[PDB]
């Protein structure tokens, strides 16, 4: 039974334009464990993106935390795109400063 990944994109610290921060892509509730996660800046693939060790929840479903250094600006867009078997198409989630 395949379970669709839930996605949250958010920063480590409350975002200040021009202040170096950390961007997180937290991906939960999925099965099977294989999954492809990429973080995007202005639609472009961010090279150095670190991934936690994959673990799982009480209900057995997997979760994982990807993150990267970033510096929020007024204009730059950031997003996390996820490919998984449970999904016909890759899902992209945009970072929203207020969430």
């Amino acid at each position: 039974i395949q379970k669709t990944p839930q996605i949250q994109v958010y920063s480590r610290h409350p975002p200040e334009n021009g202040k170096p921060n950390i961007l997180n892509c937290y991906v939960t509730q999925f099965h099977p464990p294989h999954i492809e996660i990429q973080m995007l800046k202005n639609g472009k693939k961010i090279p150095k993106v670190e991934m936690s060790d994959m673990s799982f929840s009480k209900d057995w479903s997997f979760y994982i935390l990807a993150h990267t250094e970033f510096t929020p600006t007024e204009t730059d867009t950031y997003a996390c795109r996820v490919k998984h078997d449970s999904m016909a198409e890759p899902k992209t989630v945009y970072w929203d400063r207020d969430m």
Partner: protein
């Protein structure tokens, strides 16, 4: 007060690309402190919290040896269950285990766990008495029969009643300054106009530990949890956690609403207004 130690094993087959990969992580409460990856260039149990690094070479050698044994044990597991169900040769499969112990404030065993799952659903688990197994289906009954004839439950009960508790208390002592020190949430309220008639009030709790937290809105002094939007508690990446709750309210009525936060790290409930 109350505490726990948990290990999480996952083995995943990849038919056509070599043997299954085995991965483990260990936790004390909400802090990860150890990990293992069979695919690593040189497979070793590695520390993930300052308070275990001080453990001597003998500790690491042993953890690594058991982890290597475990990965082989789970590879046999995967192949064996494959046969029980007569699955196809092409598909990947998973075998999971989580085990550990809870101890009360007195440091005595509250209870022990050892549950296995196959392809994401219960397969076999050790019962709460730690003397019998619950098998989810026919295949599992076979596994259960073997574990019974080998009397493995006794070995498991000994680890959980002994080793598991003893070492949890040890980690708890060595890591007391972080592990036994709740970090209060830093809370605040943001204001987001939707229309000229509607605005979103969002209540944030940041940098808290442990993960357990309560968050809710009230209007005029009483609940409105219906109409409350939450997000799941999420990790900040630095061992602390985040959460927010939001409500859409009428313009010029923002002053009716309060946000309420409860967390082990606070002596007393908190209230915020816009």
């Amino acid at each position: 007060g109350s505490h726990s130690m948990r290990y999480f094993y996952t083995a995943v087959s990849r038919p056509g690309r070599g043997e299954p990969r085995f991965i483990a992580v260990g936790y004390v409460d909400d802090t990860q402190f150890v990990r293992f990856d069979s695919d690593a260039a040189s497979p070793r149990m590695e520390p993930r919290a300052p308070w275990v690094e001080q453990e001597g070479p003998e500790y690491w050698e042993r953890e690594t040896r058991n982890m290597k044994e475990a990965t082989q044990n789970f590879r046999v597991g995967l192949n064996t269950l494959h046969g029980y169900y007569n699955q196809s040769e092409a598909g990947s499969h998973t075998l999971q285990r989580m085990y550990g112990c809870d101890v009360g404030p007195d440091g005595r065993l509250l209870r022990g766990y050892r549950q296995d799952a196959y392809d994401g659903a219960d397969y076999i688990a050790l019962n709460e008495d730690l003397r019998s197994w619950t098998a989810a289906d026919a295949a599992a009954q076979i596994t259960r029969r073997k574990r019974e004839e080998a009397g493995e439950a006794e070995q498991c009960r000994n680890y959980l009643e002994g080793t598991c508790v003893e070492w949890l208390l040890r980690y708890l002592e060595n890591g007391n300054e972080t592990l036994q020190r709740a970090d209060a949430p830093k809370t605040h309220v943001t204001h987001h106009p939707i229309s000229d008639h509607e605005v979103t009030l969002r209540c944030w709790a940041l940098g808290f530990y442990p993960e357990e937290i309560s968050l809710s809105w009230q209007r005029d002094g009483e609940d409105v949890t219906q109409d409350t939007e939450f997000v799941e508690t999420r990790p900040a990446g630095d061992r602390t956690f985040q959460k927010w709750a939001a409500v859409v309210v009428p313009s010029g009525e923002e002053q009716r609403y309060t946000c309420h936060v409860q967390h082990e790290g606070l002596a007393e409930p908190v209230t915020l207004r816009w």
